């Protein structure tokens, strides 16, 4: 290896969207780039949909994905990951004015891995007030896969990116949504989203897997090995830490 192609969405701020000038930058664009000088290789970051971004990939578009992608047990399938190189639990999101902010959380963090009789009651506590509500989540997201399985007599509207889900929650079109903390929590500290809160459990595992990493192809076993090596320094060494705190807010470094 001497120069590898990134993907990313381009549209999952502050993972990785836009500037003014339409540069991809982002936590991904930022940590890819770290990661990449201490594998001694040449960096290209690329715009993809979210739609095809694993199939992409699978196809030889491109040779790795950097797109805020969780490390889920259905992708794993598919695809390989590196390490994982941020740690976030879900959680769910409504407006400032919302009654469903007024709900009691039992179980603050909620693991998914293996549901006891006391957890699986806090989720159908949820599911019951979330009847009749209208719930907006991206396609092809653990949010609509944990959304479609854990609870289906939910009506959930599926949206190309986030920022459309964004969109409609705060026109009135869509009641509540569904995301990773490291996502809600910048959205949410924003002045000009005063108007969204963020509220629930806050979920781990299960369908949603451990943690963001960085989607290899499986036969690229010595491209996953560089990647995991380059991780763990930038762990190791408050890079991750550092880069969570200028992008998020908060770390969520594992
Ligand atoms: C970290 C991020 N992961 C999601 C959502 C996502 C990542 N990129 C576009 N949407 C996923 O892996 O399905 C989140 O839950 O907030």
Redesign the pocket.
Known sequence: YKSITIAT?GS?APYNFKDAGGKLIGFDIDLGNDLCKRMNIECKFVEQA?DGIIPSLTAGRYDAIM????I?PAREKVIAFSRPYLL?P?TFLTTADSPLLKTQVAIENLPLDNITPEQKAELDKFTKIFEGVKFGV?AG???EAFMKQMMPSVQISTYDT?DNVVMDLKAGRIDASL??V??LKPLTDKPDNKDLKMFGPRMTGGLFGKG?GVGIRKEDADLKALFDKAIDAAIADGTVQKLSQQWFGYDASP
């Open positions: 969405e999952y979210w797109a805020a992608m969780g889920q976030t879900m991206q997201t653990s949010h986030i995301a990773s490291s996502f963001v």
